[PDB]
Amino acid sequence: MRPEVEQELAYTLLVELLAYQFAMPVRWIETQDVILAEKRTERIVEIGPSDTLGGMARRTLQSKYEAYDAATSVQRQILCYCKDAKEIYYDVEP
Amino acid sequence: NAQAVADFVHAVGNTGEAFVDRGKDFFAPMDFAIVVGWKAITKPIFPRKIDGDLLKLVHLSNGYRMVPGAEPLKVGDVLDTTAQINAVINQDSGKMVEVCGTLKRDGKPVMYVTSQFLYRGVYTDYENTFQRKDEVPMQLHIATPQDLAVLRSKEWFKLDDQHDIELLGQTLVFRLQSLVRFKNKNVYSSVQTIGQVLLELPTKEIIQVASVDYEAGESHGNPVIDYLQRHGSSIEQPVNFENPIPLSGKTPLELRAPASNENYARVSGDYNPIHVSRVFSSYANLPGTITHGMYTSAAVRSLVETWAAENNIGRVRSYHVNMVGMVLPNDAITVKLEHVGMIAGRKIIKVDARNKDTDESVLQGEAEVEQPVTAYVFTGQGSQEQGMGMDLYATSPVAKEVWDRADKHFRENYGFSIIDIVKNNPKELTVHFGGPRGKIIRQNYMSMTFETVNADGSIKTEKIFKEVDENSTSYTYRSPSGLLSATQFTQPALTLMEKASFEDMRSKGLVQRDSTFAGHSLGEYSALVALADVMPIESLVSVVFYRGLTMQVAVERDEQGRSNYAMCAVNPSRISPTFTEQALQYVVENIAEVTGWLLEIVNYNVANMQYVAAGDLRALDTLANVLNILKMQKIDIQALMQSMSLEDVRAHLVEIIQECRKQTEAKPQPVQLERGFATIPLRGIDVPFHSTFLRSGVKPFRSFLLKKINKTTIDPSKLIGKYIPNVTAKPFEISKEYFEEVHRLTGSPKIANILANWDKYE
Amino acid sequence: IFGGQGNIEEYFDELREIYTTYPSFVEDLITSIAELLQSLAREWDAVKQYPKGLDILQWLHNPESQPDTDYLVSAPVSFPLIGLVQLAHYMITCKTLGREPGELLERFSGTTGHSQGIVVAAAIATARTWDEFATAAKRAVELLFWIGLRSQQAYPRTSLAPSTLQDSVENGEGTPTPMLSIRDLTRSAVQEHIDATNQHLPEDRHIGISLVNSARNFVVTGPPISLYGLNLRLRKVKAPTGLDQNRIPFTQRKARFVNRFLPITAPFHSPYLAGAHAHILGDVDDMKIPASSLVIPVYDTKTGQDLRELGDEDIIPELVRMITYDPVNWETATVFPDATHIVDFGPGGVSGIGVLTNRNKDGTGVRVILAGAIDGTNTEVG
């Protein structure tokens, strides 16, 4: 509960996490699953030049979350910054 | 009261499984606040200086606002009801009392029920009329010393003695409270304004650089807010749309006032005869037995829950109605809901309720409601394209500046523009170390510290830019396929486009508060800076630029430019549908300590779809082989781990390995990998990054990160538990247990040292 | 044989046919059972559920006062009001013959009901007098009143996502309830889909098989919200009504079934109506229908056996469990030995359990008659 403590902790955890990211495999499935399964996100927004993580997360929606989404009645929406630009900014014509 | 709750709900019309003790939720309507706090909310109307005909009172307005972070009301709760009188002013419609409720649980405020009452009639009792408004946050930007000199020339402006941080060239925040007493409905009998003048440092440190204190009587306007209202701008305010998005649908939502207000009166506490008895209301010159003000509010507000937030009440963080139509019982009522703006990641929702016969306005007001569940992920290398985010550049004054500050940096320090590299992708580019600011650049090229230790244990500290000395006039970058293709540039550029893009969304209030964010390879750094201000943008690009540098020098290449290793992606599905994650793992780890080379699954991207392996060229050749065999060999790993024990399949693999292995050493010429069955090599990679190889230069990059990142800048509150790293597939947490999962996967001497002291952190 | 809640929201329309067509015969028990309800509706536990009122005679007299189909379909109004219509039918049958309630009651061999109908079926097996009829009539009616009422309060209607709401509607299904129908699909499979769904759900909101109306006809319960999640899977499996398959190997085609929600307001025959059972019993301990007062055999809902095979316990206790807990294994409890004619007094015309069972027993030689209506759209039913 010491703010100044939490800082230096978050800090060196951050600093370390980044440092070793170099020589440490990228577990993007496990990460995607924290997003889709743990926090059950409805809107996945991708930020970048292509829909790479987008279709990457559409593939994880098929090979795993098929019947899960069907049972849980989970609504999902994958947006890239490029392709799905308008829906991000809530821009629709009447 | 667990029961009193279900009584309220079943009385107004609410139906959310969040209230009925099933599923995942049991909370209590925020509507219950005026039932709980009904005491402190009502009391203040009575004092002797507010002498009105309480019979001819009407509920005028009322809004709730749930303190940021605070969870909704649950049943096992104990709430302390605090209120005070924010303003009592006599409008022409009558006389007005503004009451500000403050429900607190555990001593911390959870929500503020603000309400307005109308003693209808004629009042000249201006003696006790007054108001405590919280005046809008203003942003006064000081540019000229003449600007400064006038901000200082103000009597009400009071400079602090914290430090002489030249206010010149920076902007200030004026969050001001003020208190006014009326005499004429036009003339301010007496006005006082106080408040704090804030400044944000380059480190995001907020300081009270000064303080405001104005006071005067017989005033016509507020000379302080005015000064600000011209020389400065408003802040933290709504971002409305051109086109209000109908939410309601064109099928108007319909509500009916019930007959017998008794039902509400009971569950509420407002037994006020006005709403229930014939003779009491009749005496008050009413249209008769007026349906409860707060009942209409509650009813329509339920739709705002069901329709806006989709029944996850946590989202509905603010609601505020003006009742301006008197609803009798059995009246049919129409409700329209409209997404009309955004604030801090929250949909603004215009709410309109009308009499179905008169179209007369019953309710009007807005509700700040959180967006659906969102997750922001930032793409990594590979997706870079020429002129990326340049369109958005010209169109967005915000992103415009993000790029500029980055470029401004790069040019003055490293001697090139990434904006140029992005716009027109040069197959080469050369920087020059000219005069005064010329030499200072090469200094930075010389001060690039690479690190590789000898196989005996001496830490060779080398230059990254070998040929750059104090006799160098220029250095030349070269790529066969454009410099936006080699990472020292590819990275800062991708980072840049993303930061800017996001910072634009933020600009328009689209960024959701309680959402998660993750990045892939590079994208983690951008993602970080994007949502948590982990570091200034010049830091970010420097950081990343160095990452790319080290990542390229890590591997050894020869005279032909010939690289030592390479990476390749593998789709286990294309082998046998029995082929699992652990299956491809087994294949690799075995080839690892059998052929002794360096091989390793570096990317775990899609469940049984996409993986990526790094390592020796021959290591990728033998792993390509083994799988090409198994695909045409038609295997079943499940059936074959029972029919042969573990060391049987194990030693059967070591067979295939040596065969495949020695056939690769038959094309010993540095190796030349090709597309296999599922083994498609990624064109354009020299270095096996995200493998235990880069463990080498993990040390220098850390010490660099420590230069570019500063603790002070960090709100652990932003990383809190909402940020997903790439080494921990789980949300960033500061718990003692996390540092262990980190230390397990990493072996951080800084972590061991901080785990051993853990008590020290209390 | 007696019907119950089964896709008929036009039940109150049947009452009008009765009141209109057979005024003399019925006007009496109509009025009385009406006022019976009007009083039960005033009881403090009940007023909550009947805000629109429970004044049957009013609605009958001035059509404009008749409440919304949504209102009438709700359990607390549906149940008792329906029973009245099932009574009025049995009543009209006997009366038109010029008989006593004991006269027709003697000339049958066995009576059963479909969920809510088992009450009027057991209670019709009591009466022999017209006085003894009106007795068991206020018995059943007020019984239903408390069964439906307390059931609703156990698991009340929750509001749903407006999105997933229209969804279920456009996708061929109905507005989501706790009662799902799955025609043309075998139990074998139906349970497998129920299994996968219950897999990802918390134990709270699981999904049970409410009734087995034939080998390919079922009903399913659980929270409407998770029943929806079954429909999501189901749609992904079944094929469009367009797809021509006359050119596809049979063992490889897509199964064409019909899933759809039902106009039933509460989770019957499920662990969800637990707390309701107790409450109901305490409202009804006054009345006592013992195993003896059953003239003609009354076949249990869950198991085919009689209620006369009891030591004359209050029937109330057994009835209430059969409705708020016990899986209606209808096809067995209705396998009437060497039957030759079966008569439907239950609710709704060509919608009553008459047809639903007629199919179960087409080949055997069992004939069916609907006392509910004098003519209709079906050929296979007199």
Neighboring chain B residues of C51 at a CB cutoff of 8 Å: 258
Resolution, expressed in angstroms to one decimal: 3.1
B108-111 and B96-105 strand pairing:
antiparallel
Helices (H) and strands (E) in chain C, counts: 16, 6
A71: distance to nearest CA of chain B, Å? 14
DSSP string for B373-396: -EEEEE--TT---TTTTSHHHHH-
Q: State how far the alpha carbon of B471 is from the alpha carbons of B338, B441, B463, B474, C270, in Å.
A: 68, 13, 15, 9, 87
Three-state DSSP state, B698: helix
Dihedral sign computed on CA atoms, order B120, B124, B125, B127: positive
Helix C162-170 vs helix C224-237: angle between axes, to the nearest 10 degrees?
Answer: 40
Find the length of chain A: 94
Given a contact cutoff of 8 angstroms between Cβ atoms, the answer to whether B89 and B130 are in contact is: yes
The Cα C55–Cα C62 span in angstroms is: 11
The three-state DSSP-derived secondary structure of B423-453 is HCCCCEEEEECCCHHHHHHHHHHHCCEEEEE
Of B379, B705, B724, the CB nearest to A18: B705
Best residue of C158, C166, C270 to probe chain B, by most B CBs closer than 10 Å? C158
Residue B398 contacts A where some CB pair is shorter than 8 Å: no
Angstroms from A67 CA to nearest CA on chain B: 15
Element (H, E) at B210: strand B206-219
**CA of residue B473 relative to chain centroid, distance:** 45
Determine contact, residues C140/C120, Cβ cutoff 8 Å: yes
Interface contact C260, partner B, CB < 8 A? no
Output the six-digit token pair for B210: 């000064």
Judge contact between A32 and B607, C-beta under 8 A. no
d(CA B401, CA A17): 29
User: Do residues B114 and B62 lie in contact, with contact meaning Cβ atoms separated by under 8 Å?
Assistant: yes
Burial B648-663 (b: 16+ CB within 10 A, else e): ebeeebeebbeebbee
If phi > 0 it is left, if psi is from -120 to 50 it is alpha, else beta; for residue B251 that is beta
At residue B442's C-alpha, the angle toward residues B439 and B446, to 5°, is: 135
Which residue from B minimizes the CA distance to A88?
Answer: B510
Distance from CA of A66 to the nearest CA of C (A): 9
Closest Cα in chain B, distance from residue C206 (Å): 10
Residue of A nearest to C164 (CA): A73
Give the C-alpha separation, B542 to B406, whole Å.
9
Identify how the structure was determined.
X-ray
Encoded tokens for C42: 């005033």
Tokens 């629109």 belong to residue: C52
Residue in chain A nearest C225 by alpha carbon: A73
Residue C9 burial class via C-beta count within 10 angstroms: exposed 0-12, middle 13-18, buried 19 and up: middle
Phi, psi of B254 (to 5 degrees): -120, 130
Phi, psi for C338 (deg, rounded to 5) = 45, 40
Neighbours of B157 (CB within 10 A): 18
Residue B290 DSSP SS3? coil
Task: Tell me if residue C315 falls in helix, strand or coil.
Answer: helix
Q: Which residues of A touch B382 (CB under 8 A)?
A: 52
Tell me the nearest-neighbour CA distance from B15 into chain C, angstroms. 5
Which chain C residue is nearest to residue A37, measuring alpha carbons?
A: C200
Nearest chain A CA: its distance from B511 CA (Å): 10
Contact state of C205 with B23 under an 8 Å Cβ cutoff: yes
**How far apart (Å, rounded) are the C-alpha atoms in residues C166 and C120?**
37
- Nearest partner of C284 among C256, C314, C240, C259, judged by Cα: C314
Is the Cβ pair A70, C199 closer than 8 Å?
A: no
Amino acid identity at B253: L
Q: Show the tokens assigned to B555.
A: 């591997």
Are the beta carbons of B727 and A43 separated by less than 8 Å?
A: no
* Chain C positions in Cβ-Cβ contact with residue A70 (cut-off 8 Å): 197, 229, 232-233, 236
Gyration radius (Cα) of chain B, Å: 34
Q: What is the largest CA-CA distance in chain C?
A: 65
Q: Which of B153, B242, B259, B162 is nearest to B208 (CA)?
A: B162
Within 10 A of B320 (CB to CB), how many other CB atoms are there? 18
From chain B, the residues in CB contact with C157 under 8 A are 15
Structure tokens at B275: 């709403």
Set of chain A residues whose Cβ sits within 8 Å of the Cβ of C228: 73
For β-strands B232-234 and B332-343, DSSP reports them as unpaired
Check if B480 contacts A (Cβ < 8 Å).
no
Helix (H, G, I), strand (E, B) or coil at B132: strand
Are residues C298 and C125 in contact, defined by beta-carbon separation less than 8 angstroms?
A: yes
Write the CA distances from C38 to B103, B498, C46, C91, C285, integer angstroms: 43, 68, 11, 22, 21
CB contact under 8 A, C196 and A73: no
Residue B730: list chain A partners with CB under 8 A: 30, 34
- The tokens describing B123, both together, are 């009042």
3-class SS at B22?
strand
Q: How many CA atoms lie within 13 A of B5 on its CB side?
A: 20
Task: State residue C206 phi and psi, 5-degree precision.
Answer: -75, -175
Two structure tokens written together for C206: 């699981």
- Rounded distance between C-alpha atoms, residue C101 and residue C98, angstroms: 10
- Phi, psi values for residue B299, rounded to 5°: -60, -55
B565 and B687 in contact (C-beta within 8 Å)? Answer: yes
Using alpha carbons only, what angle is made at residue C35 by residues C30 and C39, rounded to the nearest 5 degrees?
A: 150
Contact at CB, C229 and A70, closer than 8 angstroms: yes
Residue found under tokens 């607190």: B104
- Whether residue B712 and residue A7 make contact (CB cut-off 8 A), yes or no, is yes
Which residue is listed with tokens 């369109």?
B391
| Chain C hits for A67, Cβ within 8 Å | 196-197, 199-200, 233
Q: Which residue has the tokens 């550029």?
A: B493
Chain B residues in contact with A91 (beta carbon < 8 A): 241, 243
- Partner A contacted by B223 (CB < 8 A): no
Q: Which amino acid is at B642?
A: Q
- Tokens 């995942």 locate to B24
All residues of chain B having their beta carbon less than 8 Å from the beta carbon of residue A38 are 731
Whether chain B has a CB inside 8 Å of the CB on C57: the answer is no
Q: How far is CA C360 from CA C215, C347, C382, in A?
A: 8, 19, 16
CA proximity to C63, closest of C104, C20, C25, C24:
C20
Interface of B with C (CB under 8 A): 10, 14-17, 20, 22-24, 258, 306-307, 310-311
